[PDB]
Design a protein around this motif. Structure first.
Motif, PDB file in Angstrom:
ATOM      1  N   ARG A  14      13.202   5.235  -2.489  1.00  0.00           N
ATOM      2  CA  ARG A  14      11.994   5.695  -1.836  1.00  0.00           C
ATOM      3  C   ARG A  14      10.777   5.099  -2.522  1.00  0.00           C
ATOM      4  O   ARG A  14      10.548   5.328  -3.713  1.00  0.00           O
ATOM      5  N   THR A  15      10.016   4.325  -1.781  1.00  0.00           N
ATOM      6  CA  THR A  15       8.783   3.761  -2.288  1.00  0.00           C
ATOM      7  C   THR A  15       7.598   4.639  -1.903  1.00  0.00           C
ATOM      8  O   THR A  15       7.394   4.955  -0.730  1.00  0.00           O
ATOM      9  N   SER A  16       6.844   5.054  -2.903  1.00  0.00           N
ATOM     10  CA  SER A  16       5.602   5.756  -2.676  1.00  0.00           C
ATOM     11  C   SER A  16       4.470   4.736  -2.638  1.00  0.00           C
ATOM     12  O   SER A  16       4.235   4.014  -3.610  1.00  0.00           O
TER      13      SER A  16
ATOM     14  N   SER B 289       5.246   7.977   1.364  1.00  0.00           N
ATOM     15  CA  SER B 289       6.623   7.759   0.961  1.00  0.00           C
ATOM     16  C   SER B 289       7.429   7.116   2.087  1.00  0.00           C
ATOM     17  O   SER B 289       7.454   7.612   3.215  1.00  0.00           O
TER      18      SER B 289
END
Length: 119
Positions: A89-91, A73
């Motif tokens: 938020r990029t996972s 994340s």
């Protein structure tokens, strides 16, 4: 332009080249960050990344390529179609083929949390 492509959830999934190049984007891009699938295709996510977090994305993207298979994340400000820098938020996931252990693309799971522009 700027079509809704049918109202979507505020989280979208995209397949992108390891340098950040969007290869395929789901229509939920419009709801999350105003952008159309087409708008991302051929662009680096780092182009639309908050200038103070652009390296943050880079470092973390490198680490998901280090982890390989582990969801990583990273939290940054994505530039919506309003040229605003909202909190997303990029996972990170690296799609590996367990035959050559190679990665075809990275999967951007993009979950928008806070906002810092829309009122």
């Amino acid at each position: 332009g700027a079509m809704d492509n049918v109202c979507q959830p505020t989280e979208f999934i995209s397949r992108h080249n390891i340098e950040g190049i969007f290869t395929f984007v789901d229509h939920r891009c419009v709801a999350t960050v105003g952008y159309q699938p087409q708008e991302l295709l051929g662009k680096n996510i780092v182009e639309f990344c908050h200038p103070e977090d652009q390296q943050l994305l880079r470092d973390s993207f490198q680490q998901v390529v280090k982890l390989k298979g582990q969801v990583l994340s990273v939290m940054f400000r994505f530039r919506s179609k309003n040229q605003e820098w909202l909190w997303m938020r990029t996972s990170s996931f690296t799609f590996q083929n367990p035959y050559s252990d190679e990665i075809e693309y990275i999967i951007c799971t993009n979950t928008n949390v806070k906002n810092s522009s829309q009122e």
